[PDB]
mmCIF file of C-alpha atoms in Angstrom:
data_model
loop_
_atom_site.group_PDB
_atom_site.id
_atom_site.type_symbol
_atom_site.label_atom_id
_atom_site.label_comp_id
_atom_site.label_asym_id
_atom_site.label_seq_id
_atom_site.Cartn_x
_atom_site.Cartn_y
_atom_site.Cartn_z
ATOM 1 C CA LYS A 7 42.515 96.691 133.268
ATOM 2 C CA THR A 8 46.353 96.615 133.393
ATOM 3 C CA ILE A 9 49.517 95.903 131.520
ATOM 4 C CA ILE A 10 52.517 94.094 133.062
ATOM 5 C CA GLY A 11 56.058 95.960 132.107
ATOM 6 C CA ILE A 12 60.016 95.286 132.888
ATOM 7 C CA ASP A 13 62.426 97.682 134.763
ATOM 8 C CA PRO A 14 61.290 101.159 135.438
ATOM 9 C CA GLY A 15 64.277 103.057 133.698
ATOM 10 C CA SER A 16 64.373 100.730 130.545
ATOM 11 C CA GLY A 17 64.078 101.737 127.003
ATOM 12 C CA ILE A 18 60.991 99.951 125.938
ATOM 13 C CA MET A 19 59.189 101.141 129.162
ATOM 14 C CA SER A 20 59.604 104.969 128.060
ATOM 15 C CA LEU A 21 58.035 103.590 124.844
ATOM 16 C CA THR A 22 54.745 102.468 126.569
ATOM 17 C CA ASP A 23 54.113 105.717 128.143
ATOM 18 C CA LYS A 24 53.989 107.494 124.910
ATOM 19 C CA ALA A 25 51.995 104.607 123.137
ATOM 20 C CA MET A 26 49.680 104.737 126.212
ATOM 21 C CA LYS A 27 49.228 108.375 124.802
ATOM 22 C CA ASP A 28 49.422 107.722 121.019
ATOM 23 C CA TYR A 29 46.515 105.260 121.361
ATOM 24 C CA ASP A 30 44.837 106.904 124.201
ATOM 25 C CA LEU A 31 44.568 104.629 126.786
ATOM 26 C CA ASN A 32 44.297 106.107 130.145
ATOM 27 C CA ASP A 33 41.968 104.016 132.247
ATOM 28 C CA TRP A 34 44.967 101.985 131.793
ATOM 29 C CA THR A 35 48.203 101.603 134.127
ATOM 30 C CA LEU A 36 51.598 100.249 133.443
ATOM 31 C CA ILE A 37 52.995 98.229 136.133
ATOM 32 C CA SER A 38 56.788 98.780 136.692
ATOM 33 C CA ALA A 39 58.378 95.152 137.642
ATOM 34 C CA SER A 40 61.499 93.186 136.809
ATOM 35 C CA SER A 41 62.061 90.412 134.129
ATOM 36 C CA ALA A 42 61.945 87.960 136.833
ATOM 37 C CA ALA A 43 58.379 88.449 137.980
ATOM 38 C CA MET A 44 57.226 89.659 134.193
ATOM 39 C CA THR A 45 57.125 86.144 133.000
ATOM 40 C CA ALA A 46 56.272 84.664 136.441
ATOM 41 C CA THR A 47 53.007 86.397 136.294
ATOM 42 C CA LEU A 48 52.494 85.309 132.515
ATOM 43 C CA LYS A 49 52.803 81.781 133.512
ATOM 44 C CA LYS A 50 50.133 82.430 136.100
ATOM 45 C CA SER A 51 47.794 83.760 133.513
ATOM 46 C CA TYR A 52 48.422 81.769 130.400
ATOM 47 C CA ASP A 53 48.065 78.396 132.280
ATOM 48 C CA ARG A 54 44.924 79.579 133.836
ATOM 49 C CA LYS A 55 44.021 81.259 130.680
ATOM 50 C CA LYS A 56 43.255 84.641 131.824
ATOM 51 C CA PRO A 57 43.392 87.779 129.928
ATOM 52 C CA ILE A 58 47.043 89.682 130.280
ATOM 53 C CA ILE A 59 48.964 92.323 128.397
ATOM 54 C CA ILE A 60 52.632 92.470 128.841
ATOM 55 C CA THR A 61 55.702 94.545 127.180
ATOM 56 C CA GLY A 62 57.005 92.026 124.895
ATOM 57 C CA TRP A 63 59.861 91.756 122.622
ATOM 58 C CA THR A 64 61.705 89.400 120.258
ATOM 59 C CA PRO A 65 63.923 87.680 120.603
ATOM 60 C CA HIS A 66 62.759 86.066 123.982
ATOM 61 C CA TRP A 67 61.897 82.386 125.281
ATOM 62 C CA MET A 68 58.216 83.116 126.100
ATOM 63 C CA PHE A 69 57.431 82.825 122.385
ATOM 64 C CA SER A 70 58.153 79.029 123.008
ATOM 65 C CA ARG A 71 56.612 77.997 126.163
ATOM 66 C CA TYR A 72 53.482 79.629 125.025
ATOM 67 C CA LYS A 73 51.982 80.723 122.016
ATOM 68 C CA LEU A 74 51.843 84.749 121.867
ATOM 69 C CA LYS A 75 50.800 87.458 119.659
ATOM 70 C CA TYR A 76 51.927 91.269 118.954
ATOM 71 C CA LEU A 77 49.227 93.876 118.833
ATOM 72 C CA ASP A 78 49.379 95.518 115.312
ATOM 73 C CA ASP A 79 50.830 99.201 114.962
ATOM 74 C CA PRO A 80 49.427 101.669 112.656
ATOM 75 C CA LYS A 81 50.587 104.703 114.948
ATOM 76 C CA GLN A 82 53.930 103.084 115.308
ATOM 77 C CA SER A 83 54.594 104.239 118.788
ATOM 78 C CA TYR A 84 57.432 101.872 119.445
ATOM 79 C CA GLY A 85 59.145 102.137 116.074
ATOM 80 C CA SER A 86 59.808 99.244 113.772
ATOM 81 C CA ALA A 87 63.499 99.379 112.502
ATOM 82 C CA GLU A 88 65.021 98.039 115.495
ATOM 83 C CA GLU A 89 68.295 96.297 116.146
ATOM 84 C CA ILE A 90 70.737 95.260 118.901
ATOM 85 C CA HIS A 91 74.330 96.430 118.818
ATOM 86 C CA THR A 92 77.575 96.153 120.490
ATOM 87 C CA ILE A 93 78.910 99.456 121.785
ATOM 88 C CA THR A 94 82.452 100.311 123.432
ATOM 89 C CA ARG A 95 83.867 103.307 125.331
ATOM 90 C CA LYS A 96 85.985 105.972 123.520
ATOM 91 C CA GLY A 97 89.352 104.854 122.612
ATOM 92 C CA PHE A 98 88.770 101.225 123.173
ATOM 93 C CA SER A 99 89.637 100.035 119.505
ATOM 94 C CA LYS A 100 93.159 100.913 120.057
ATOM 95 C CA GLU A 101 93.985 100.089 123.565
ATOM 96 C CA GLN A 102 92.954 96.551 122.875
ATOM 97 C CA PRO A 103 92.721 96.147 118.928
ATOM 98 C CA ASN A 104 92.402 92.343 119.628
ATOM 99 C CA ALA A 105 89.200 92.410 121.617
ATOM 100 C CA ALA A 106 87.420 95.243 119.607
ATOM 101 C CA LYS A 107 87.940 92.976 116.818
ATOM 102 C CA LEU A 108 86.361 90.138 118.412
ATOM 103 C CA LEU A 109 83.349 92.328 119.293
ATOM 104 C CA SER A 110 82.994 93.853 115.991
ATOM 105 C CA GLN A 111 82.402 90.296 114.159
ATOM 106 C CA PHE A 112 79.732 89.415 116.651
ATOM 107 C CA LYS A 113 76.431 88.592 114.893
ATOM 108 C CA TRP A 114 74.011 86.044 115.121
ATOM 109 C CA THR A 115 70.250 85.508 114.965
ATOM 110 C CA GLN A 116 67.107 85.310 117.007
ATOM 111 C CA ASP A 117 66.623 81.439 117.383
ATOM 112 C CA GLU A 118 70.223 80.903 117.961
ATOM 113 C CA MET A 119 70.267 82.947 121.118
ATOM 114 C CA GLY A 120 66.908 81.473 122.215
ATOM 115 C CA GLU A 121 68.625 78.198 122.295
ATOM 116 C CA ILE A 122 70.639 79.348 125.136
ATOM 117 C CA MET A 123 67.576 81.632 126.687
ATOM 118 C CA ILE A 124 65.430 78.704 127.039
ATOM 119 C CA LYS A 125 67.964 76.367 129.008
ATOM 120 C CA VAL A 126 68.740 79.587 131.132
ATOM 121 C CA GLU A 127 65.223 79.388 131.715
ATOM 122 C CA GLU A 128 65.020 75.691 132.241
ATOM 123 C CA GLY A 129 67.244 76.736 135.303
ATOM 124 C CA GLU A 130 70.780 76.057 134.216
ATOM 125 C CA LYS A 131 73.569 78.688 134.868
ATOM 126 C CA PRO A 132 74.761 80.951 132.135
ATOM 127 C CA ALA A 133 78.353 79.965 131.788
ATOM 128 C CA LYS A 134 77.574 76.151 131.703
ATOM 129 C CA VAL A 135 75.336 76.709 129.010
ATOM 130 C CA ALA A 136 77.780 78.966 127.076
ATOM 131 C CA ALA A 137 80.516 76.378 127.137
ATOM 132 C CA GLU A 138 77.988 73.936 125.263
ATOM 133 C CA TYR A 139 76.873 76.438 122.887
ATOM 134 C CA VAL A 140 80.722 77.276 121.951
ATOM 135 C CA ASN A 141 81.024 73.535 121.296
ATOM 136 C CA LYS A 142 78.084 72.941 119.227
ATOM 137 C CA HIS A 143 77.898 76.062 116.752
ATOM 138 C CA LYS A 144 81.849 76.059 116.625
ATOM 139 C CA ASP A 145 82.144 77.673 113.153
ATOM 140 C CA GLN A 146 80.559 80.722 114.093
ATOM 141 C CA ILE A 147 82.872 81.311 116.837
ATOM 142 C CA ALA A 148 85.747 80.607 114.619
ATOM 143 C CA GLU A 149 84.473 83.543 112.599
ATOM 144 C CA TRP A 150 83.319 85.647 115.658
ATOM 145 C CA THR A 151 87.227 85.462 116.193
ATOM 146 C CA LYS A 152 88.861 85.096 112.795
ATOM 147 C CA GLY A 153 92.154 86.890 113.317
ATOM 148 C CA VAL A 154 91.783 87.113 117.423
ATOM 149 C CA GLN A 155 94.884 85.839 118.911
ATOM 150 C CA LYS A 156 94.752 84.443 122.380
ATOM 151 C CA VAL A 157 95.580 87.050 125.138
ATOM 152 C CA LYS A 158 97.575 86.805 128.245
ATOM 153 C CA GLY A 159 94.775 87.735 130.602
ATOM 154 C CA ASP A 160 94.156 91.544 129.809
ATOM 155 C CA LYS A 161 91.039 92.145 131.597
ATOM 156 C CA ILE A 162 87.644 93.042 129.612
ATOM 157 C CA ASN A 163 84.695 94.585 131.414
ATOM 158 C CA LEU A 164 81.172 93.289 130.091
ATOM 159 C CA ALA A 165 78.822 95.520 131.613
ATOM 160 C CA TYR A 166 75.243 94.596 130.832
ATOM 161 C CA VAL A 167 71.551 94.898 131.594
ATOM 162 C CA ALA A 168 69.911 91.594 132.931
ATOM 163 C CA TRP A 169 67.068 91.214 130.345
ATOM 164 C CA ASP A 170 67.063 87.355 129.435
ATOM 165 C CA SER A 171 68.439 88.009 125.947
ATOM 166 C CA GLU A 172 71.273 89.865 127.254
ATOM 167 C CA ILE A 173 72.186 87.226 129.610
ATOM 168 C CA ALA A 174 72.542 84.835 126.743
ATOM 169 C CA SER A 175 74.720 87.383 124.500
ATOM 170 C CA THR A 176 76.910 88.859 127.542
ATOM 171 C CA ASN A 177 77.878 85.434 128.668
ATOM 172 C CA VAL A 178 78.652 83.873 125.256
ATOM 173 C CA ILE A 179 81.089 86.432 124.929
ATOM 174 C CA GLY A 180 81.863 86.187 128.011
ATOM 175 C CA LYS A 181 83.019 82.789 127.195
ATOM 176 C CA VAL A 182 84.436 83.212 123.782
ATOM 177 C CA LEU A 183 86.533 86.092 125.094
ATOM 178 C CA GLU A 184 87.579 84.181 128.306
ATOM 179 C CA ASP A 185 88.323 81.037 125.798
ATOM 180 C CA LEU A 186 91.299 82.994 124.921
ATOM 181 C CA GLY A 187 92.791 84.242 128.132
ATOM 182 C CA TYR A 188 90.997 87.345 128.851
ATOM 183 C CA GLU A 189 89.790 87.837 132.334
ATOM 184 C CA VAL A 190 86.191 88.692 132.767
ATOM 185 C CA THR A 191 84.009 90.498 135.092
ATOM 186 C CA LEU A 192 80.354 91.176 134.129
ATOM 187 C CA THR A 193 78.937 94.134 135.879
ATOM 188 C CA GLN A 194 74.871 94.076 136.175
ATOM 189 C CA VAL A 195 73.354 97.538 135.795
ATOM 190 C CA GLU A 196 70.323 99.414 135.010
ATOM 191 C CA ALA A 197 69.654 100.692 131.519
ATOM 192 C CA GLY A 198 70.714 104.219 132.237
ATOM 193 C CA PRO A 199 74.088 103.798 134.306
ATOM 194 C CA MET A 200 74.810 101.040 132.021
ATOM 195 C CA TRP A 201 75.417 103.789 129.024
ATOM 196 C CA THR A 202 77.032 106.241 131.697
ATOM 197 C CA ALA A 203 79.276 103.281 132.577
ATOM 198 C CA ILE A 204 80.452 103.095 128.921
ATOM 199 C CA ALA A 205 80.456 106.990 128.175
ATOM 200 C CA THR A 206 82.479 107.825 131.168
ATOM 201 C CA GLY A 207 84.657 104.668 130.765
ATOM 202 C CA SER A 208 83.643 102.529 134.159
ATOM 203 C CA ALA A 209 83.493 99.732 131.718
ATOM 204 C CA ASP A 210 85.023 98.656 128.469
ATOM 205 C CA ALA A 211 82.179 97.057 126.187
ATOM 206 C CA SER A 212 78.520 96.714 126.321
ATOM 207 C CA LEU A 213 76.652 94.307 124.382
ATOM 208 C CA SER A 214 73.468 95.511 125.334
ATOM 209 C CA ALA A 215 72.012 98.098 122.883
ATOM 210 C CA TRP A 216 68.516 98.092 121.018
ATOM 211 C CA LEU A 217 68.740 101.001 118.522
ATOM 212 C CA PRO A 218 68.094 103.260 116.958
ATOM 213 C CA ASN A 219 65.021 104.151 118.687
ATOM 214 C CA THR A 220 64.413 101.577 122.056
ATOM 215 C CA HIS A 221 67.698 103.371 123.543
ATOM 216 C CA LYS A 222 67.465 106.582 121.408
ATOM 217 C CA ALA A 223 67.157 108.947 124.504
ATOM 218 C CA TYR A 224 70.609 107.770 125.951
ATOM 219 C CA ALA A 225 72.214 107.659 122.462
ATOM 220 C CA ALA A 226 71.619 111.312 121.982
ATOM 221 C CA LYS A 227 72.245 111.972 125.648
ATOM 222 C CA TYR A 228 75.871 110.859 125.247
ATOM 223 C CA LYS A 229 76.893 111.659 121.670
ATOM 224 C CA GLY A 230 80.319 111.712 120.591
ATOM 225 C CA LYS A 231 81.348 109.949 123.757
ATOM 226 C CA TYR A 232 81.312 106.211 122.922
ATOM 227 C CA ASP A 233 81.934 103.726 120.026
ATOM 228 C CA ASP A 234 79.330 101.813 117.897
ATOM 229 C CA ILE A 235 81.417 98.980 116.261
ATOM 230 C CA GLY A 236 79.017 96.242 115.590
ATOM 231 C CA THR A 237 75.447 95.198 114.719
ATOM 232 C CA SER A 238 74.724 92.106 116.800
ATOM 233 C CA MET A 239 71.156 91.526 115.138
ATOM 234 C CA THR A 240 68.625 92.960 112.743
ATOM 235 C CA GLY A 241 64.964 92.935 112.467
ATOM 236 C CA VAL A 242 63.677 92.976 116.144
ATOM 237 C CA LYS A 243 60.239 93.355 117.231
ATOM 238 C CA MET A 244 58.685 94.823 120.508
ATOM 239 C CA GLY A 245 55.418 96.206 121.783
ATOM 240 C CA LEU A 246 52.392 95.246 124.051
ATOM 241 C CA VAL A 247 51.808 91.437 123.927
ATOM 242 C CA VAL A 248 48.696 89.333 124.669
ATOM 243 C CA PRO A 249 48.280 85.369 124.756
ATOM 244 C CA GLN A 250 46.987 84.007 121.440
ATOM 245 C CA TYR A 251 43.744 83.069 123.013
ATOM 246 C CA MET A 252 42.500 86.463 122.970
ATOM 247 C CA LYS A 253 41.432 86.484 119.382
ATOM 248 C CA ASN A 254 38.694 89.173 120.008
ATOM 249 C CA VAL A 255 41.467 91.519 120.604
ATOM 250 C CA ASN A 256 44.128 92.001 117.887
ATOM 251 C CA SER A 257 45.496 95.464 117.934
ATOM 252 C CA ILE A 258 46.367 98.379 120.564
ATOM 253 C CA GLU A 259 43.045 100.406 119.547
ATOM 254 C CA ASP A 260 40.989 97.284 120.448
ATOM 255 C CA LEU A 261 42.703 96.698 123.786
ATOM 256 C CA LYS A 262 40.157 99.383 124.870
ATOM 257 C CA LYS A 263 36.814 98.639 123.526
#
């Protein structure tokens, strides 16, 4: 009688706590873990056809190794109008008007990322796989960078949080940036310190926002002290996730009878 979650100070983790309250869920416990073990434990269960509840989110590669389902949400505790976003520190757009114009035209979809995630979960390395995707889809890139002139190794900081999804986007722009002379270092932090780094300026840009709810708390915590320039994805879902052979359990409120 437990749930399996991801990082302690993560956006979705602070929305499972209120969902456990909203739905009344209290002989239950949320296991604060890491992405690495979350899906490790999911393989342990799914392949042994065991009951399991995970803090799931879309886009993710797990919805492709296994058949999985979200639990309906009447008391929308997680929220449902979600989008991933590109945010930079204050005064960025004008220091380097070139890069902030690359960032700002970055749009892409849920399966087009997953392409890179599934390979990264194959056990490939994030740059090599990115270098392949820049060659395949090669007229999305040309738009990602319409009017972006190759630079002479000005440096750009890409602080991210290492959720699967954000090792497929941070590195693909990552590379698309690199591809143009920019020097890249690529700073792995917790959600929390991530926002801080941006708002105080220890990083330049941050392709790692789930808003205007998941990461809500920090957004208000640091108001007029950052730049929201772009909308990477629209229509992203998240919540409690069980594997598809628990047909007797189709909602949060049933999770409990």
